[PDB]
Design a protein around this ligand. Structure first.
Ligand SMILES: O=c1ccn([C@@H]2O[C@H](COP(=O)(O)OP(=O)(O)OP(=O)(O)O)[C@@H](O)[C@H]2O)c(=O)[nH]1
Ligand SMILES: [Mg+2]
Ligand SMILES: [Zn+2]
Length: 471
């Protein structure tokens, strides 16, 4: 016996779960208009479910083809991924000016999916691994944000694109790239006065030291000796050179530096990114990566589900629904429980970043280019069956009432096991739809999802189930 409070009105409590459901269904059908209809329509298929898969096998397979096509869109080839790597290296040069032992870790979808489309935000993590081991990372993040911000501004980042978020729960920097070639690796130095012969050698030397033996291709001064342009070997070398702190001879002679062109610039200037100082996202993405790579159809299905979850509205964190991260776990959990992929123990992904090698997310093509057409058609069938099974599993198979979506153990996880079988009623921590976070303990990814919210989710799961059987 326990309390059950509604989330659609502040004055409704019951002592059973069925009553809380009936309540929402009755006097809150406006919040969940299609739940009752789609459910009834979906329940008619259940007794003849295998006959339906038989009859609609061609449609299912065609959906499988569409899944690999949609997935192929977010896979822009190894060269496009390598643009993210160079941007990562360029950022590392910048942040090391602020803290020499800091390194830049990419995390997020590029890690998870092993591809990058060229548009989706890149997540940057800035960590001193040594200090993290000592338990002294990150520093005061409000101060770190303003410091790196000012470092980026001086290397040419405009306030138009650079948004410091110093006062947030997790202080970050967000770069919002604008919408649009030897000049991309070319920079200009603006001096506040004329440079002597000795001054000019000192500047060039500071630059030459910044990039090494081959780093500089050419250098030229204007006729007033107050401007020096430089062409470096690479876009990354161009940011390296721009990060040099020159010690000139002439007193009060200072320099300003920026890319030679306003639009044609190193990778970092041209990509949206979020910069944070915590390592929480690194271990996460690595876990997701290992899972999603253990099956040829795992990443295409994940990509499709993410899009569906956003369009259907079940992926919407600002309003208290699931995140894309949570959707992946739903997908992976289903894969695990139905034997599509082997169980991965979350603890078997190292928490420490000491032995870390994969700063640059390894590239893995969305589909093996060298497979046969017979094999490719098999994957289409497989992808279709798997996506359909997902919506079937969560519509009819998974016990939303008493179980938890969890990758923390290979077997069933009950709500009771996590102590999620009761709610603290006095905007509570909801336990209607439960997804366990693999590394944050006692955190439900569905904690903002009350009963009416939950039924809206159930609605969309029914809808997608019905969708994949029809042309
Ligand atoms: O609750 C969370 C959410 C996110 N993350 C970390 O953030 C990374 C990004 O997870 P997101 O949910 O932000 O997915 P996404 O960036 O691919 O898609 P959108 O934002 O466009 O919806 C994840 O890979 C995970 O490492 C967490 O660690 N915990
Ligand atoms: Mg995100
Ligand atoms: Zn109510």
């Amino acid at each position: 016996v326990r309390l059950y409070s509604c989330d659609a009105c502040p004055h409704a409590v019951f002592t059973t779960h069925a009553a809380l459901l009936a309540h929402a269904e009755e006097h809150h059908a406006d919040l969940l208009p299609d739940h009752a209809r789609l459910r009834r329509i979906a329940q008619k298929l259940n007794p003849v479910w295998n006959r339906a898969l038989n009859a609609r096998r061609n449609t299912i397979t065609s959906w499988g083809k569409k899944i690999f096509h949609v997935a192929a869109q977010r896979d822009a080839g190894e060269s496009k991924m390598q643009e993210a790597h160079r941007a990562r290296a360029q950022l590392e040069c910048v942040v090391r000016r602020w803290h020499d032992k800091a390194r830049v870790f990419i995390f997020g979808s590029s890690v998870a999916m092993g591809v990058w489309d060229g548009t989706a935000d890149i997540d940057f993590a800035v960590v001193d691994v040594d200090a993290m081991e000592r338990g002294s990372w990150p520093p005061l993040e409000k101060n770190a944000v303003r410091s790196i911000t000012e470092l980026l501004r001086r290397v040419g980042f405009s306030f138009v694109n650079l948004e410091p978020i110093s006062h947030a729960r997790v202080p970050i920097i967000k770069h919002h790239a604008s919408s649009p070639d030897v000049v991309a690796r070319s920079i200009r130095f603006i001096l506040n006065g004329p440079a002597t012969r000795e001054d000019r050698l000192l500047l060039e030397g500071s630059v030459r030291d910044a990039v090494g033996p081959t780093g500089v291709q050419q250098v030229w001064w204007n006729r007033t000796s107050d401007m020096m342009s430089a062409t470096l070997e690479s876009t990354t070398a161009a940011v390296r050179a721009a990060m040099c702190s020159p010690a000139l001879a002439s007193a009060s002679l200072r320099t300003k530096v920026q890319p030679a062109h306003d639009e044609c610039r190193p990778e970092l200037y041209n990509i949206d990114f979020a910069l944070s100082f915590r390592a929480f996202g690194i271990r996460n993405s690595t876990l997701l990566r290992k899972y999603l790579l253990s099956h040829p159809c795992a990443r295409p299905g994940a990509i499709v589900l993410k899009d569906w979850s956003k369009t259907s509205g079940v992926n919407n964190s600002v309003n208290g629904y699931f995140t894309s991260y949570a959707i992946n776990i739903m997908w992976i959990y289903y894969l695990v429980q139905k034997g599509y992929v082997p169980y991965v123990d979350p603890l078997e992904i190292p928490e420490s970043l000491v032995n870390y090698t994969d700063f640059d997310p390894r590239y893995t093509p969305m589909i093996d280019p060298e497979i046969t057409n017979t094999e490719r058609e098999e994957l289409y069938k497989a992808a279709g069956d798997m996506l359909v099974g997902f919506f079937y599993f969560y519509s009819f198979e998974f016990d939303w009432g008493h179980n938890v979506i969890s990758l923390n153990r290979p077997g069933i996880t009950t709500k009771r096991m996590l102590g999620w079988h009761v709610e603290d009623v006095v905007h509570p921590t909801r336990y209607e739809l439960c997804i366990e976070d693999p590394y944050e303990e006692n955190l439900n990814l569905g904690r903002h999802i009350g009963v009416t919210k939950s039924l809206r989710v159930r609605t969309e799961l029914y809808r997608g189930l019905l969708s994949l059987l029809k042309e």
